[PDB]
UniProtKB/Swiss-Prot annotation:
S-adenosyl-L-methionine binds at L6, G31, E52, D77, N94. SMART domains: rADc. The keyword Acyltransferase does not apply. GO terms for molecular function: RNA binding; rRNA (adenine-N6,N6-)-dimethyltransferase activity. Its main location: cytoplasm. This is Probable ribosomal RNA small subunit methyltransferase A. Belongs to the class I-like SAM-binding methyltransferase superfamily. rRNA adenine N(6)-methyltransferase family. RsmA subfamily. Its EC number is 2.1.1.-.
Length: 265
């Protein structure tokens, strides 16, 4: 039902400020809403693209485009839109929470200078979570390995109408493709799926239990792992620590070493 439009001008401004916009910036916004945030991006940016599914919101677009010459609407599914065909450097958005996850990685894949995105509070906690904590998981690592992230503000239900049951959060994302060397990104993705499927088990036991994620059966993985651990380096001894207690740096390092081992096995 009319689900949760951003209305509170203070939280709009907080998002716009956090985005540090200048007239040289081209912004992508996900969702038109009432066009309150849209208007603020138009004021401060070179140009703003808005991907919107709901065509009944067109009145807001036409009224807005009568005032600003630098807004362009793309009518469609954000997950379906080819972002490679658009040239932007920032994303600022009150996201539809249902597409929270696949839209984050799609945007990161395409790349941007900076994103200032609204997520439900719980999801943002997991994005920014530190190792050894309740909210630390695959989402944390998947994100922090590719980007620097922080919650710039917590947002109460009173900032929206109809107004949600939960808090939201404004999250700042700064991609840093160079903070970690990754031997093979696809092997990293598989590794992360395998290990966070057994979050409270040792890395060693997680890998054996979810070996199919890395394209090996259980017995192969047992043997591989024993061969891999026959050399005595420190990082390898961290394979007996519990998955959730390894930091992003520890996971990257361990998977880099595992991949290189497998390459000569």
């Amino acid at each position: 039902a009319a689900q949760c439009f951003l209305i509170d001008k203070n939280f709009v401004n907080k998002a716009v400020e956090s985005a540090n916009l200048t007239k040289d910036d081209v912004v992508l916004e996900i969702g038109l809403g009432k066009g309150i945030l849209t208007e603020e991006l138009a004021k401060n940016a070179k140009k703003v693209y808005v991907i919107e599914i709901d065509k009944s919101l067109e009145p807001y677009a036409n009224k807005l485009k009568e005032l600003y010459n630098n807004i362009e609407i793309i009518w469609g599914d954000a997950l379906k839109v080819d972002l490679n065909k658009l040239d932007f450097n920032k994303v600022v958005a009150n996201l539809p929470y249902q597409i929270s996850s696949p839209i984050t990685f799609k945007l990161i894949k395409r790349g941007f200078d900076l994103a200032v995105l609204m997520y439900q509070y719980e999801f943002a906690k997991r994005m920014v979570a530190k190792e050894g904590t309740k909210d630390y998981g695959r989402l944390s690592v998947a994100v922090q390995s590719r980007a620097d992230v922080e919650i710039v503000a917590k947002v109460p239900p009173s900032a929206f109408y109809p107004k949600p049951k939960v808090y939201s959060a404004i999250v700042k994302i700064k991609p840093n493709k160079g903070k970690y060397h990754i031997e093979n990104e696809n092997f990293f993705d598989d590794f992360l799926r395998a290990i966070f499927q057994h979050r409270n088990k040792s890395v060693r036991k997680a890998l054996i239990d979810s070996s199919k994620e890395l394209n090996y059966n259980k017995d192969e993985m047992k043997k591989i792992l024993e061969d891999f651990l026959n050399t005595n380096s420190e990082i390898k001894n961290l394979i007996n620590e519990k998955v959730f207690k390894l930091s992003v740096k520890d996971i990257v390092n361990l998977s880099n070493e595992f991949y290189r081992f497998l390459q000569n096995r």
